[PDB]
Amino acid sequence: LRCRLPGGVITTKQWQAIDKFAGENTIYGSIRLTNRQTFQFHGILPVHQMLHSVGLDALNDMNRNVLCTSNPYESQLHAEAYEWAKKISEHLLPLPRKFKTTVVIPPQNDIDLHANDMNFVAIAENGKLVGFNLLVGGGLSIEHGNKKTYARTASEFGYLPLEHTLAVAEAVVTTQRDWGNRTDRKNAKTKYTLERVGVETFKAEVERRAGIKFEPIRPYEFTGRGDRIGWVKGIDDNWHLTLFIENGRILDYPARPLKTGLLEIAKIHKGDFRITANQNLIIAGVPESEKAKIEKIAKESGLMNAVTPQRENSMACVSFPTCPLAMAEAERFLPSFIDNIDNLMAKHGVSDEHIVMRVTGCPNGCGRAMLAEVGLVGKAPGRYNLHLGGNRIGTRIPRMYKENITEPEILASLDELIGRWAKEREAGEGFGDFTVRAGIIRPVLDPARDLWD
Ligand code: SRM
Ligand code: SF4
Ligand SMILES: [K+]
């Protein structure tokens, strides 16, 4: 069961309702936060009455949860951008393949825009959103050894004033709907359609249908994709506490009652929560007077246990035991794998650094390994394809470095590479960029043509 939850914003009342159901009506008893800012129950022995009772709904609807940057540096931009993610979501509510959409607030690419079909990058002037740059065609799914499939980054179409948002959203969806491949579902996705007809052809059709002309792209840059773990000052006297939740798996573990702690917080919390695209949770809108109260609960429940910057920037998909398409472990492999990476980082004197590292259980790519600096793609039990060369902001697809290897083999490759980066990197140079500059891996410049060797 997966909930429709635009922007990952969930009230404390809704949380308490899902917390109950998770504990009493599912085999696993957990709340699993997903990387598309929503949650999932595993092993449901219905849920819809419960969701519906607190104003929630579980999603042939070929649409997925609409994402929205969760913790913007310019705190006041969230409300507006959130409002638009909600409107786009409702507007699109009832395609060849599933359609994924996001609303992004630079300089954060926490939502990983390049893994999505349609992206609206917020352009603000004087603290007010004035429009969006539209990027179309991202998608990460591939099939092992099938060179007709590929991960692709989204292409820039142009800028549009706020007023044309919904018309443009509708036009992209309908154009993809009509032009999408009408036979092979593995080529139905927008990324394939764009490559077949061309960005300019697709863009012109969208302008025709929307009844507008795109203006030139407005300047925007991204500085990162991680969450802002800990306390950050929001608007007024409000604060936001982002809690790192390993694999987004919320359950009470011996001596770390993560699930109970969150329930205790939801009961005294003023504002609401925000599920992030990094499978974490933000206790949003905490008045200064309440910080100590919230921090005490989070602290004692083990929700604020300090982890390395590395662990904070690593991600894995669900995979076994519940995913029927799983080829190798991901969520259950990540904790001990990062324990090992942490050692490597310490051994090389880069314990304060991080490499965006992701593990996906099979090539479908839910863990977003195809946008990581170091991506692990499951191929069989205990075996993964190792990809290197993405960047910190997620605008480049990592090329396959080694194929079908085991963890010990992976660790050995990384020990050597991290060693070289540690000593040969320029001031503030990321790992992915380093492997490409140092000639360790050739960059993927045009995925549709040079992703596969
Ligand atoms: C929970 C999540 C991974 C996580 O650990 O967070 C996940 C889990 C699953 N995904 Fe996904 N996907 C998740 C994000 C994505 C991502 C990343 C993203 O959207 O940001 C992708 C890659 C980008 C992309 O779409 O290209 C992704 C691409 C897929 C695909 C391949 C789609 C394709 O176009 O080929 C499938 C399989 C399919 O639909 O054929 C899939 C299928 C599935 C299913 C439902 C398996 C199935 O079809 O029966 C997995 C359920 C496993 C389980 O036991 O819970 N999932 N999946 C994410 C659910 C997000 C959500 O709330 O909607
Ligand atoms: S990438 Fe594969 S194994 Fe992981 S959750 Fe998605 S479908 Fe399952
Ligand atoms: K996490």
Short mmCIF file of C-alpha atoms and ligand atoms in Angstrom, two decimals:
data_model
loop_
_atom_site.label_atom_id
_atom_site.label_comp_id
_atom_site.label_asym_id
_atom_site.label_seq_id
_atom_site.Cartn_x
_atom_site.Cartn_y
_atom_site.Cartn_z
CA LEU A 1 0.00 0.00 0.00
CA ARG A 2 1.38 3.37 -1.10
CA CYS A 3 -0.18 6.74 -0.32
CA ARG A 4 -0.68 9.78 -2.56
CA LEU A 5 1.04 12.53 -0.53
CA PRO A 6 2.08 15.56 -2.59
CA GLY A 7 5.27 17.19 -1.37
CA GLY A 8 5.60 14.68 1.46
CA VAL A 9 3.59 16.94 3.80
CA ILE A 10 1.63 14.87 6.33
CA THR A 11 -0.19 16.13 9.44
CA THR A 12 0.47 14.77 12.91
CA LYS A 13 -3.12 13.49 13.06
CA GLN A 14 -2.62 11.58 9.80
CA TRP A 15 0.68 10.24 11.10
CA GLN A 16 -0.96 8.83 14.23
CA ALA A 17 -3.54 7.09 12.03
CA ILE A 18 -0.88 5.47 9.82
CA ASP A 19 1.24 4.63 12.85
CA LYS A 20 -1.65 2.64 14.29
CA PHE A 21 -2.47 0.76 11.15
CA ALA A 22 1.17 -0.11 10.55
CA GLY A 23 1.52 -1.62 13.97
CA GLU A 24 -1.75 -3.52 14.07
CA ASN A 25 -2.66 -4.52 10.50
CA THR A 26 0.58 -5.40 8.70
CA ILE A 27 3.01 -8.31 8.87
CA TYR A 28 6.10 -6.11 9.24
CA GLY A 29 4.68 -3.47 11.58
CA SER A 30 6.80 -0.78 9.97
CA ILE A 31 6.27 2.55 8.24
CA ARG A 32 8.64 2.70 5.26
CA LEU A 33 9.35 6.20 3.98
CA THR A 34 9.98 6.12 0.21
CA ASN A 35 12.32 8.28 -1.84
CA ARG A 36 9.33 9.86 -3.62
CA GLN A 37 8.23 11.55 -0.36
CA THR A 38 5.47 9.20 0.75
CA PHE A 39 5.16 6.01 2.80
CA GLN A 40 4.41 2.32 2.41
CA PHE A 41 3.03 -0.48 4.56
CA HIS A 42 4.42 -3.96 4.01
CA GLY A 43 2.44 -7.17 4.38
CA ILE A 44 -1.12 -6.00 4.73
CA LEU A 45 -3.10 -8.98 6.00
CA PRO A 46 -9.35 -1.98 4.69
CA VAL A 47 -6.53 0.60 4.63
CA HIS A 48 -8.57 2.86 2.35
CA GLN A 49 -11.23 3.57 5.00
CA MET A 50 -8.41 4.50 7.37
CA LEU A 51 -6.55 6.66 4.85
CA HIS A 52 -9.78 8.24 3.71
CA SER A 53 -10.81 8.90 7.31
CA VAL A 54 -7.83 11.25 7.84
CA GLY A 55 -8.06 12.77 4.37
CA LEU A 56 -5.63 10.43 2.59
CA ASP A 57 -5.85 8.12 -0.44
CA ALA A 58 -3.70 5.33 -1.89
CA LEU A 59 -2.95 5.96 -5.59
CA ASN A 60 -4.51 2.07 -13.95
CA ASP A 61 -3.44 5.47 -12.56
CA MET A 62 -0.12 5.90 -14.34
CA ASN A 63 0.87 8.81 -12.13
CA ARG A 64 3.18 8.80 -9.14
CA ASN A 65 3.64 11.06 -6.13
CA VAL A 66 4.49 14.65 -7.07
CA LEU A 67 7.66 15.76 -5.26
CA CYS A 68 8.51 19.13 -3.76
CA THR A 69 11.77 20.37 -2.28
CA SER A 70 11.19 19.83 1.44
CA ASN A 71 13.48 22.25 3.25
CA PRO A 72 14.39 25.26 1.06
CA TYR A 73 17.22 27.54 2.24
CA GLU A 74 14.85 30.42 1.56
CA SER A 75 12.21 28.95 3.93
CA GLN A 76 9.38 31.19 2.73
CA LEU A 77 9.37 29.73 -0.78
CA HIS A 78 8.12 26.34 0.44
CA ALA A 79 4.44 27.27 0.91
CA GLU A 80 4.01 28.48 -2.67
CA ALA A 81 6.01 25.70 -4.31
CA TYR A 82 4.12 23.20 -2.12
CA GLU A 83 0.81 24.71 -3.17
CA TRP A 84 1.81 24.21 -6.81
CA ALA A 85 2.91 20.58 -6.32
CA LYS A 86 -0.52 19.94 -4.77
CA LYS A 87 -2.32 21.61 -7.69
CA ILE A 88 -0.31 19.74 -10.30
CA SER A 89 -1.03 16.52 -8.40
CA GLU A 90 -4.78 17.13 -8.34
CA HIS A 91 -4.77 18.44 -11.89
CA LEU A 92 -3.20 15.23 -13.17
CA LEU A 93 -5.32 12.90 -11.04
CA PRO A 94 -7.63 10.69 -13.22
CA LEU A 95 -0.62 6.79 -20.17
CA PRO A 96 1.83 4.40 -21.96
CA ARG A 97 4.05 4.21 -18.88
CA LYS A 98 3.99 5.79 -15.42
CA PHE A 99 4.59 9.54 -15.21
CA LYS A 100 6.71 11.18 -12.51
CA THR A 101 6.65 14.92 -11.71
CA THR A 102 8.44 17.32 -9.35
CA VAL A 103 8.53 20.94 -8.26
CA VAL A 104 12.14 22.00 -7.49
CA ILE A 105 13.44 24.98 -5.53
CA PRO A 106 17.10 25.68 -6.41
CA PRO A 107 19.79 25.35 -5.17
CA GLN A 108 18.54 22.01 -3.85
CA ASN A 109 18.01 18.99 -6.07
CA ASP A 110 17.00 16.77 -3.17
CA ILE A 111 14.06 15.53 -5.27
CA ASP A 112 16.51 14.25 -7.95
CA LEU A 113 14.82 15.91 -10.91
CA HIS A 114 16.69 13.89 -13.51
CA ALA A 115 14.85 10.69 -12.58
CA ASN A 116 11.52 12.32 -13.60
CA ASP A 117 9.38 12.87 -16.72
CA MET A 118 8.31 16.43 -15.92
CA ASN A 119 10.01 18.95 -13.66
CA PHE A 120 9.08 22.49 -12.68
CA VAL A 121 12.07 24.42 -11.40
CA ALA A 122 10.82 27.39 -9.31
CA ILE A 123 12.08 30.85 -10.28
CA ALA A 124 11.50 33.40 -7.51
CA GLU A 125 11.84 37.16 -7.48
CA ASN A 126 11.52 39.09 -4.25
CA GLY A 127 10.55 35.96 -2.27
CA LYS A 128 7.69 35.25 -4.64
CA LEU A 129 7.53 32.53 -7.27
CA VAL A 130 7.09 34.11 -10.68
CA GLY A 131 7.40 31.04 -12.88
CA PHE A 132 9.08 27.72 -13.66
CA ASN A 133 11.77 26.44 -16.01
CA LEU A 134 10.43 23.18 -17.45
CA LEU A 135 12.70 20.12 -17.79
CA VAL A 136 11.32 16.98 -19.46
CA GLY A 137 12.40 13.37 -20.04
CA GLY A 138 14.29 11.95 -17.08
CA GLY A 139 14.06 8.25 -16.27
CA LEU A 140 16.48 5.74 -14.73
CA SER A 141 15.13 2.28 -15.53
CA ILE A 142 17.21 -0.07 -17.69
CA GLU A 143 17.34 -3.74 -18.46
CA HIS A 144 20.58 -5.64 -17.90
CA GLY A 145 22.55 -5.99 -21.12
CA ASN A 146 19.74 -4.43 -23.15
CA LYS A 147 21.32 -1.51 -25.03
CA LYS A 148 17.90 -0.39 -26.22
CA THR A 149 17.16 0.77 -22.68
CA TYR A 150 18.98 3.58 -20.85
CA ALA A 151 18.78 6.06 -18.03
CA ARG A 152 18.39 9.61 -19.29
CA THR A 153 18.57 13.10 -17.76
CA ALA A 154 15.75 15.65 -18.31
CA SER A 155 16.03 18.23 -21.11
CA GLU A 156 15.32 21.97 -20.71
CA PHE A 157 12.29 23.19 -22.64
CA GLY A 158 12.10 26.79 -21.48
CA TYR A 159 10.60 29.18 -18.94
CA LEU A 160 6.89 29.80 -18.35
CA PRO A 161 5.08 32.29 -16.10
CA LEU A 162 3.21 30.82 -13.17
CA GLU A 163 -0.13 31.34 -14.90
CA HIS A 164 0.55 28.71 -17.62
CA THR A 165 1.66 25.98 -15.23
CA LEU A 166 -1.34 23.68 -15.45
CA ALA A 167 -1.82 24.11 -19.21
CA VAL A 168 1.83 23.20 -19.79
CA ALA A 169 1.59 20.26 -17.37
CA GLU A 170 -1.47 18.96 -19.23
CA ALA A 171 0.12 19.47 -22.67
CA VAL A 172 3.24 17.44 -21.79
CA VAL A 173 1.15 14.57 -20.45
CA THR A 174 -1.12 14.46 -23.50
CA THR A 175 1.72 14.74 -25.99
CA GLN A 176 3.51 11.85 -24.28
CA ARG A 177 0.20 9.95 -24.15
CA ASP A 178 -0.35 10.27 -27.90
CA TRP A 179 3.28 9.85 -29.00
CA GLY A 180 4.42 7.19 -26.54
CA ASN A 181 5.36 3.87 -28.14
CA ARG A 182 2.19 1.89 -28.88
CA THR A 183 3.57 -1.65 -28.58
CA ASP A 184 6.69 -2.17 -26.47
CA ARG A 185 6.12 -1.04 -22.90
CA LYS A 186 9.93 -0.96 -22.30
CA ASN A 187 10.11 2.01 -24.70
CA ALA A 188 6.86 3.74 -23.68
CA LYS A 189 8.49 6.13 -21.21
CA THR A 190 8.89 9.85 -22.10
CA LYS A 191 12.70 9.57 -22.27
CA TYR A 192 12.30 7.24 -25.29
CA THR A 193 9.67 9.37 -26.97
CA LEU A 194 11.88 12.49 -26.72
CA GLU A 195 14.76 10.65 -28.34
CA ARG A 196 12.53 9.34 -31.10
CA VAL A 197 10.81 12.61 -32.09
CA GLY A 198 13.40 15.11 -30.83
CA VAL A 199 13.16 17.65 -28.00
CA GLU A 200 12.30 20.51 -30.37
CA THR A 201 9.47 18.55 -32.02
CA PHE A 202 8.04 17.54 -28.66
CA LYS A 203 8.51 21.10 -27.30
CA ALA A 204 6.75 22.67 -30.30
CA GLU A 205 3.80 20.33 -29.87
CA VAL A 206 3.60 21.26 -26.20
CA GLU A 207 3.58 24.98 -27.08
CA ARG A 208 0.86 24.34 -29.62
CA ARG A 209 -1.34 22.44 -27.16
CA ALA A 210 -0.65 24.73 -24.17
CA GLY A 211 -1.34 27.88 -26.20
CA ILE A 212 1.94 29.51 -25.18
CA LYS A 213 5.51 30.06 -26.30
CA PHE A 214 8.30 29.17 -23.93
CA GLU A 215 10.58 32.01 -22.91
CA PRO A 216 14.32 31.32 -22.58
CA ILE A 217 15.41 29.37 -19.49
CA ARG A 218 15.95 31.55 -16.41
CA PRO A 219 19.30 30.97 -14.61
CA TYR A 220 19.39 28.30 -11.91
CA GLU A 221 22.08 26.19 -10.25
CA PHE A 222 22.08 23.33 -7.79
CA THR A 223 24.52 22.93 -4.95
CA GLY A 224 23.45 19.53 -3.59
CA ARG A 225 20.85 16.82 -2.99
CA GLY A 226 21.17 16.01 0.72
CA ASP A 227 18.75 16.84 3.53
CA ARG A 228 19.69 19.37 6.18
CA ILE A 229 20.03 16.94 9.07
CA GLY A 230 19.32 18.59 12.41
CA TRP A 231 17.90 22.00 13.25
CA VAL A 232 17.49 24.70 10.65
CA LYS A 233 15.81 28.04 11.21
CA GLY A 234 12.61 28.51 9.27
CA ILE A 235 10.32 31.55 9.12
CA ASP A 236 9.23 33.55 12.20
CA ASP A 237 10.36 31.79 15.38
CA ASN A 238 9.93 28.41 13.68
CA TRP A 239 12.53 25.66 13.35
CA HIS A 240 12.74 22.46 11.34
CA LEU A 241 14.32 19.30 12.71
CA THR A 242 15.26 16.77 10.01
CA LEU A 243 15.89 13.30 11.40
CA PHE A 244 18.12 10.83 9.58
CA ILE A 245 16.19 7.56 9.25
CA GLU A 246 18.29 4.72 7.86
CA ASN A 247 16.49 3.34 4.82
CA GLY A 248 13.45 5.28 5.98
CA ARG A 249 12.48 2.14 7.89
CA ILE A 250 10.43 3.17 10.94
CA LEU A 251 10.18 0.40 13.49
CA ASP A 252 10.99 0.01 17.15
CA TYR A 253 14.30 -1.65 17.53
CA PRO A 254 15.68 -2.81 20.87
CA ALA A 255 16.97 0.32 22.65
CA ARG A 256 15.96 2.53 19.69
CA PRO A 257 12.17 2.90 19.70
CA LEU A 258 12.13 4.96 16.48
CA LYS A 259 8.46 4.27 15.79
CA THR A 260 7.27 5.12 19.32
CA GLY A 261 9.47 8.22 19.44
CA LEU A 262 7.82 9.56 16.28
CA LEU A 263 4.38 8.83 17.74
CA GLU A 264 5.33 10.68 20.94
CA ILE A 265 6.52 13.61 18.84
CA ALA A 266 3.41 13.59 16.64
CA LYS A 267 1.30 13.85 19.80
CA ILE A 268 2.98 17.05 21.04
CA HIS A 269 4.05 18.54 17.70
CA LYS A 270 2.51 21.84 16.67
CA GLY A 271 2.95 21.82 12.88
CA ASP A 272 3.33 18.80 10.64
CA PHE A 273 5.94 16.40 9.23
CA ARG A 274 7.59 16.30 5.84
CA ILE A 275 8.81 13.08 4.28
CA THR A 276 11.94 13.85 2.22
CA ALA A 277 13.14 12.39 -1.08
CA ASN A 278 16.09 10.96 0.86
CA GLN A 279 13.74 8.77 2.95
CA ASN A 280 14.09 10.98 6.03
CA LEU A 281 11.62 12.94 8.13
CA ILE A 282 11.29 16.59 8.95
CA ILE A 283 9.49 17.70 12.08
CA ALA A 284 8.39 21.02 10.56
CA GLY A 285 7.35 24.28 12.16
CA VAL A 286 8.60 23.77 15.70
CA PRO A 287 8.37 26.99 17.69
CA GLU A 288 11.62 27.92 19.47
CA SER A 289 9.94 27.35 22.84
CA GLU A 290 9.23 23.75 21.82
CA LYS A 291 12.66 22.77 20.46
CA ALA A 292 13.92 21.35 23.71
CA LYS A 293 10.77 19.29 24.21
CA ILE A 294 10.91 17.76 20.71
CA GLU A 295 14.68 17.25 20.91
CA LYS A 296 14.36 15.32 24.15
CA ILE A 297 12.00 12.73 22.64
CA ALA A 298 13.95 12.43 19.36
CA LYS A 299 17.19 12.15 21.34
CA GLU A 300 16.04 9.41 23.72
CA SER A 301 14.36 7.36 21.00
CA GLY A 302 17.61 7.04 19.05
CA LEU A 303 16.25 9.25 16.23
CA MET A 304 19.13 11.65 16.61
CA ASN A 305 21.97 9.14 16.83
CA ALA A 306 24.86 10.77 15.02
CA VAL A 307 25.96 9.15 11.75
CA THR A 308 28.71 10.02 9.31
CA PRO A 309 28.12 12.47 6.46
CA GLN A 310 28.62 9.36 4.28
CA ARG A 311 25.71 7.44 5.74
CA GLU A 312 23.58 10.57 5.49
CA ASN A 313 24.22 10.68 1.76
CA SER A 314 23.66 7.02 0.95
CA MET A 315 20.44 5.41 -0.21
CA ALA A 316 19.03 1.98 -1.12
CA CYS A 317 15.69 0.68 -2.43
CA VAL A 318 13.41 -1.76 -0.55
CA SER A 319 14.43 -4.95 -2.43
CA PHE A 320 14.15 -8.23 -0.41
CA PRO A 321 12.22 -9.51 1.41
CA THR A 322 9.16 -7.82 -0.09
CA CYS A 323 10.10 -6.80 -3.64
CA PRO A 324 9.25 -9.56 -6.13
CA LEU A 325 11.62 -8.12 -8.73
CA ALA A 326 14.62 -8.05 -6.44
CA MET A 327 17.88 -9.57 -7.73
CA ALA A 328 20.20 -8.56 -4.88
CA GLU A 329 19.75 -7.07 -1.38
CA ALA A 330 19.68 -3.28 -1.07
CA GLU A 331 17.96 -1.98 2.04
CA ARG A 332 19.18 -4.94 4.11
CA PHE A 333 22.68 -4.67 2.65
CA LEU A 334 23.19 -0.93 2.99
CA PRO A 335 23.78 -0.59 6.75
CA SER A 336 26.75 -3.00 6.94
CA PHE A 337 28.00 -1.87 3.55
CA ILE A 338 28.18 1.71 4.78
CA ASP A 339 29.86 0.44 7.97
CA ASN A 340 32.61 -0.71 5.60
CA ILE A 341 32.69 2.50 3.54
CA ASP A 342 32.93 4.49 6.77
CA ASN A 343 36.08 2.51 7.59
CA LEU A 344 37.49 3.22 4.17
CA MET A 345 36.74 6.90 4.53
CA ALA A 346 38.51 6.96 7.93
CA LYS A 347 41.46 4.96 6.58
CA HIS A 348 41.99 7.62 3.92
CA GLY A 349 41.40 10.64 6.13
CA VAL A 350 38.10 11.69 4.54
CA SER A 351 35.66 10.79 7.34
CA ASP A 352 34.12 14.27 7.08
CA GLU A 353 33.51 13.89 3.34
CA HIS A 354 30.74 12.07 1.52
CA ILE A 355 30.21 10.31 -1.80
CA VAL A 356 26.56 10.09 -3.01
CA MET A 357 26.36 6.29 -2.89
CA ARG A 358 23.32 4.29 -3.79
CA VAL A 359 22.33 0.66 -4.10
CA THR A 360 19.43 -0.50 -6.21
CA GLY A 361 18.27 -4.14 -6.01
CA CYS A 362 17.65 -4.59 -9.72
CA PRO A 363 18.02 -2.40 -12.86
CA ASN A 364 14.51 -0.90 -12.46
CA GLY A 365 16.51 1.62 -10.43
CA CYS A 366 14.25 2.61 -7.52
CA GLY A 367 17.28 3.37 -5.35
CA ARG A 368 18.38 5.98 -7.94
CA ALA A 369 21.80 4.41 -8.35
CA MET A 370 21.83 5.73 -11.93
CA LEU A 371 22.27 9.31 -10.67
CA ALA A 372 24.78 8.52 -7.86
CA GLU A 373 28.52 9.22 -7.88
CA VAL A 374 28.90 5.51 -7.01
CA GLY A 375 25.95 3.33 -7.92
CA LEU A 376 25.45 -0.35 -7.22
CA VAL A 377 22.94 -2.16 -9.42
CA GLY A 378 21.86 -5.65 -8.34
CA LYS A 379 22.42 -8.45 -10.83
CA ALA A 380 22.06 -11.63 -8.70
CA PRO A 381 22.28 -12.66 -5.01
CA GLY A 382 25.31 -10.86 -3.61
CA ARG A 383 26.36 -9.47 -7.01
CA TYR A 384 26.17 -5.96 -8.37
CA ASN A 385 27.26 -3.88 -11.35
CA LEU A 386 29.36 -0.94 -10.08
CA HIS A 387 28.84 2.42 -11.78
CA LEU A 388 31.09 5.44 -11.20
CA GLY A 389 31.14 9.01 -12.41
CA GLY A 390 27.94 10.75 -11.42
CA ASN A 391 28.25 14.03 -9.57
CA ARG A 392 27.04 15.44 -6.26
CA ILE A 393 24.10 17.36 -7.73
CA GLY A 394 22.84 14.49 -9.89
CA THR A 395 23.03 15.80 -13.43
CA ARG A 396 25.18 13.02 -14.86
CA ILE A 397 24.59 9.27 -15.34
CA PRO A 398 27.41 7.05 -14.02
CA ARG A 399 28.91 4.62 -16.57
CA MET A 400 29.35 0.95 -15.70
CA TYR A 401 32.80 0.38 -14.22
CA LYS A 402 32.77 -3.29 -13.17
CA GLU A 403 30.17 -5.95 -13.75
CA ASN A 404 28.54 -8.65 -11.65
CA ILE A 405 30.96 -8.46 -8.71
CA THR A 406 30.60 -9.20 -5.00
CA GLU A 407 30.90 -6.88 -1.99
CA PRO A 408 34.53 -7.87 -1.21
CA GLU A 409 35.39 -7.09 -4.83
CA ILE A 410 33.47 -3.82 -4.60
CA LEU A 411 35.15 -2.76 -1.37
CA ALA A 412 38.58 -3.47 -2.86
CA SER A 413 37.85 -1.29 -5.89
CA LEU A 414 36.58 1.53 -3.70
CA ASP A 415 39.50 1.31 -1.25
CA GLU A 416 41.88 2.05 -4.13
CA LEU A 417 39.74 4.73 -5.71
CA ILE A 418 38.93 6.55 -2.47
CA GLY A 419 42.64 6.43 -1.71
CA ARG A 420 43.46 8.20 -4.97
CA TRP A 421 40.72 10.80 -4.57
CA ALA A 422 41.84 11.59 -1.01
CA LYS A 423 45.33 12.48 -2.20
CA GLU A 424 44.75 13.70 -5.76
CA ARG A 425 41.56 15.71 -5.55
CA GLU A 426 41.51 19.45 -6.03
CA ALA A 427 39.99 21.78 -3.42
CA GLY A 428 36.41 20.64 -2.88
CA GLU A 429 36.36 18.26 -5.84
CA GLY A 430 33.73 15.54 -5.51
CA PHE A 431 34.52 11.84 -5.93
CA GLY A 432 32.43 11.35 -9.09
CA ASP A 433 33.98 14.39 -10.80
CA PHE A 434 37.38 13.15 -9.75
CA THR A 435 37.00 9.70 -11.41
CA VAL A 436 36.02 11.44 -14.63
CA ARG A 437 38.85 14.04 -14.48
CA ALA A 438 41.47 11.45 -13.46
CA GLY A 439 40.46 9.30 -16.42
CA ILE A 440 39.22 6.46 -14.20
CA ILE A 441 35.87 6.30 -16.03
CA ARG A 442 34.65 7.93 -19.26
CA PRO A 443 31.73 10.30 -18.69
CA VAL A 444 28.25 9.59 -20.09
CA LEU A 445 27.64 12.63 -22.26
CA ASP A 446 24.55 11.60 -24.22
CA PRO A 447 22.90 8.61 -22.44
CA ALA A 448 20.78 7.49 -25.41
CA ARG A 449 23.97 6.96 -27.43
CA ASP A 450 26.99 6.54 -25.09
CA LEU A 451 25.72 4.98 -21.85
CA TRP A 452 26.63 1.44 -22.92
CA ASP A 453 30.11 0.33 -23.88
C1 SRM B 1 9.60 2.24 -2.48
C2 SRM B 1 10.51 2.59 -3.71
C3 SRM B 1 12.07 2.40 -3.35
C4 SRM B 1 12.57 2.93 -2.02
O1 SRM B 1 13.25 2.19 -1.29
O2 SRM B 1 12.26 4.10 -1.68
C5 SRM B 1 10.13 1.71 -4.86
C6 SRM B 1 9.74 0.39 -4.76
C7 SRM B 1 9.30 -0.39 -5.80
N1 SRM B 1 9.18 0.06 -7.09
FE1 SRM B 1 9.85 1.83 -7.87
N2 SRM B 1 10.18 2.45 -6.01
C8 SRM B 1 10.58 3.71 -5.71
C9 SRM B 1 11.06 4.67 -6.56
C10 SRM B 1 11.29 4.55 -7.91
C11 SRM B 1 12.35 5.28 -8.64
C12 SRM B 1 12.95 6.57 -8.19
C13 SRM B 1 12.06 7.79 -8.16
O3 SRM B 1 10.92 7.73 -8.66
O4 SRM B 1 12.49 8.83 -7.63
C14 SRM B 1 12.44 4.76 -9.86
C15 SRM B 1 13.45 5.20 -10.86
C16 SRM B 1 13.14 6.35 -11.82
C17 SRM B 1 12.26 5.92 -12.97
O5 SRM B 1 11.06 5.70 -12.76
O6 SRM B 1 12.77 5.79 -14.10
C18 SRM B 1 11.56 3.61 -9.87
C19 SRM B 1 11.34 2.73 -10.90
C20 SRM B 1 10.55 1.58 -10.85
C21 SRM B 1 10.28 0.61 -11.95
C22 SRM B 1 10.78 0.70 -13.38
C23 SRM B 1 9.90 1.69 -14.12
C24 SRM B 1 10.22 1.81 -15.59
O7 SRM B 1 9.84 2.84 -16.20
O8 SRM B 1 10.82 0.88 -16.15
C25 SRM B 1 9.47 -0.37 -11.45
C26 SRM B 1 8.86 -1.63 -12.12
C27 SRM B 1 7.77 -1.39 -13.13
O9 SRM B 1 6.90 -0.55 -12.89
O10 SRM B 1 7.78 -2.04 -14.17
C28 SRM B 1 9.24 -0.14 -10.04
C29 SRM B 1 8.58 -1.01 -9.21
C30 SRM B 1 8.51 -0.92 -7.86
C31 SRM B 1 7.88 -1.93 -6.92
C32 SRM B 1 6.41 -1.39 -6.62
C33 SRM B 1 7.88 -3.39 -7.39
C34 SRM B 1 6.70 -3.92 -8.22
O11 SRM B 1 6.46 -3.41 -9.34
O12 SRM B 1 6.02 -4.85 -7.76
C35 SRM B 1 8.84 -1.82 -5.74
C36 SRM B 1 8.11 -2.16 -4.47
C37 SRM B 1 9.13 -2.75 -3.50
C38 SRM B 1 8.57 -2.97 -2.09
O13 SRM B 1 8.56 -4.12 -1.61
O14 SRM B 1 8.16 -1.98 -1.44
N3 SRM B 1 9.87 1.04 -9.74
N4 SRM B 1 11.02 3.46 -8.59
C39 SRM B 1 10.12 3.96 -4.29
C40 SRM B 1 8.60 4.10 -4.26
C41 SRM B 1 8.46 5.57 -4.57
C42 SRM B 1 7.04 6.03 -4.50
O15 SRM B 1 6.60 6.39 -3.39
O16 SRM B 1 6.35 6.02 -5.54
S1 SF4 B 2 15.04 -1.44 -7.85
FE1 SF4 B 2 14.22 -3.54 -8.17
S2 SF4 B 2 14.63 -4.58 -6.20
FE2 SF4 B 2 14.67 -2.32 -5.70
S3 SF4 B 2 12.62 -1.85 -5.04
FE3 SF4 B 2 12.80 -1.35 -7.27
S4 SF4 B 2 12.03 -3.18 -8.26
FE4 SF4 B 2 12.52 -3.89 -6.25
K K B 3 17.43 8.01 4.85
#
